[PDB]
């Protein structure tokens, strides 16, 4: 029921199901909070998604990689580069591979016409030792040269 409501972009219904779990004695695992975060993120709601992540952390549960990558993708779609970097730092702190999420963040920043923040995040990741795909390298080079940005 929770996943059905989450796929229907109904975070309030997901919270209803979570409170039903609490009443029934079923402890909400990371899957339920992942569903809540996805429900908030699907309808472009960054504040509610961060609140759901805070609820998951306060519940003592360890968030799934899918929750973190959904949050970084939402931040990139909104252009919130610093929030994406904070989420990447949190993912690194929780012993996770941040390469795929870094790629998602920079690609979303490029897609939503945020080339400055996309370049900043890409260069942070590249100086950090991460390697990007060939397609991402070509995209960054071509877009920067189309924008007239030879330095980046």
């Amino acid at each position: 029921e929770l996943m059905e409501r989450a796929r229907n972009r109904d975070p309030s219904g997901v919270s209803e199901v979570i409170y039903d779990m609490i009443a029934a004695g079923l402890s909400p695992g990371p899957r339920s909070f992942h569903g809540l975060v996805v429900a908030h993120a699907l309808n472009g709601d960054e504040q509610g998604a961060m609140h759901s992540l805070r609820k998951e952390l306060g519940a003592g549960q360890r968030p799934l990689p899918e929750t973190m990558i959904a949050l970084v993708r939402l931040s990139g779609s909104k252009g919130n580069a610093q929030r994406g970097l904070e989420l990447l730092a949190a993912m690194e702190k929780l012993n996770y591979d941040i390469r795929q999420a870094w790629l998602i963040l920079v690609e979303e920043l490029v897609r939503t016409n945020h080339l400055e923040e996309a370049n900043k995040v890409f260069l942070k990741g590249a100086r950090g030792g991460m390697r990007a795909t060939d397609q991402l390298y070509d995209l960054m080079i071509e877009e920067d040269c189309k924008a007239g940005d030879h330095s980046n």
């Binding site: 029921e1 209803e16 199901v17 409170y19 039903d20 009443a23 029934a24």
Partner: peptide, 11 residues
């Protein structure tokens, strides 16, 4: 009180 298809509860 909570009423739904999943659980009927009293707190």
């Amino acid at each position: 009180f909570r009423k739904n298809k999943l659980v009927w509860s009293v707190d």
